[PDB]
Design a binder for this molecule. Sequence first.
Ligand SMILES: CO[C@@H]1O[C@H](CO)[C@@H](O)[C@H](O)[C@H]1S[C@@H]1O[C@H](CO)[C@@H](O)[C@H](O)[C@H]1O
Length: 606
Amino acid sequence: HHAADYVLYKDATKPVEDRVADLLGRMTLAEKIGQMTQIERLVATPDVLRDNFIGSLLSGGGSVPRKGATAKEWQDMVDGFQKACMSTRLGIPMIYGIDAVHGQNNVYGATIFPHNVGLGATRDPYLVKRIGEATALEVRATGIQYAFAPCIAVCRDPRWGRCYESYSEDRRIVQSMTELIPGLQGDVPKDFTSGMPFVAGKNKVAACAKHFVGDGGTVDGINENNTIINREGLMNIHMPAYKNAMDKGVSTVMISYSSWNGVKMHANQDLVTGYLKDTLKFKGFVISDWEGIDRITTPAGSDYSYSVKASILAGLDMIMVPNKYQQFISILTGHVNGGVIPMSRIDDAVTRILRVKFTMGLFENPYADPAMAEQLGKQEHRDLAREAARKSLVLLKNGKTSTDAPLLPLPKKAPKILVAGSHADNLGYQCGGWTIEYQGDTGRTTVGTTILEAVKAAVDPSTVVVFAENPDAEFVKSGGFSYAIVAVGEHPYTETKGDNLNLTIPEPGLSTVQAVCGGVRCATVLISGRPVVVQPLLAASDALVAAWLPGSEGQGVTDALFGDFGFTGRLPRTWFKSVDQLPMNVGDAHYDPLFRLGYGLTTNAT
Ligand SMILES: CO[C@@H]1O[C@H](CO)[C@@H](O)[C@H](O)[C@H]1S[C@@H]1O[C@H](CO)[C@@H](O)[C@H](O)[C@H]1O
């Protein structure tokens, strides 16, 4: 079609399937296996990318060009890698992926949205869509084209360290919140076939429905463990949102570390090929989790040859290696060379990978747009996060007796007020895991507004605001305070580090609440990724708010505390009386909740 050196796969006017087939037909085995390989930026160099025909890069949690890097530093990094991949014989661009799971959260100055559990409290799928949209822009600001989100796990036991990454214990809520997908990717056409991948263009990103399947059903909430449930329960609780994702054109699906009735998901051909590909008709690419194939065996890594065979025969298309690429490539090449893995399986994985890259426009815009850099941390996005944070708050108590004047909303004018607690002025704690570092961190880790900062920005100029992190009872009684706001809760955690069998917040937390509330009427703001033992905090407090992990915009908290808006959030999870009850979900025999799923008190705006 019209020049003498014309190559159909390079012609942007041709249909994606024709471009895929035309490119696939020219590729060597090495070129094919290279597409199937995703590596960490930490092991990538121009020569490694070129010589191994690498298909994809990622940043794992905390893998950044440097601390504090600007949006343009990210763009330059990603373009440097792309430049190498475009210099190969076939010039196939790489796709760069990152965990942008509550904003573009690895990046300094990125807007940090509430974590998923809080978003489930909003019951507002359109808000989540808009959060998708903002997140796509902030990811493209850094030159990155692919976000490992949404997590559509249905957490069935809050002892799990990733329970905050699940919108709800109720699959219906999780289903509703798959609107993140068309936020990230754009809306699919009227005509769209369910299971086809979609991304609108250069201002959107490929999404990833993760982690397939039953990641939130593991025994005792143990991370990466076994999920014991008949096919009917799997299909009724853990699967449904995957079908909503297919309907909205999710481009990729990541496989779970977890097992189903003892079968490693990363080795499960019946579910990956038989169900996801052959029954749901998924036509995007299937990606492993980080060393997910390694973890097929025990010990992990003990038979990498079998890891590669089992995973690729099960139907995985791209492997998140992410470090030992030479070994992965060498072993997979051996398997194809000895007939253990047929060419048809390679060609299917590469078809899927190229389908997503061509569909999303990556061959037409392989490089970053520097005009997008300024999207990072844009005030419109912070305003959105602030709206989400406010809508996520669940008011659990507002008055010790039914006859008390309701404490909330608090007045903005008062002579003197106290702000206290370990979580009142700690941005890191209010963001939780997957913020700047993998495990999150403490203190002023990025740009945002702590609860203390938000109180000071909200109150009348005549209101004196005193901060004390852990005041004693006498300090409070002697202080002349009108009221206190006290914020406490969980420390940041991610993944197995957050698996917790007792779910009691660290001290001092409760002790500070008791000392503050003992002296002056108090509003307790509980920061957590999940329900935690709360009766003692409730007993001390006039009012108590479950604020979850609200992110960078602390003003979302004060917007509701001071009555600019009313509380509307409703628990997206059951709140247990005791961890001995667990697991306990809306539906079981012994359903005896402290607060039932859907509970939440309200207030009216002042
Ligand atoms: C970088 O993510 C985590 O890093 C630690 C330490 O290097 C690993 O040992 C963990 O098992 C992974 S977990 C895995 O990471 C994916 C990529 O960051 C992520 O998308 C997925 O949701 C996680 O399960």
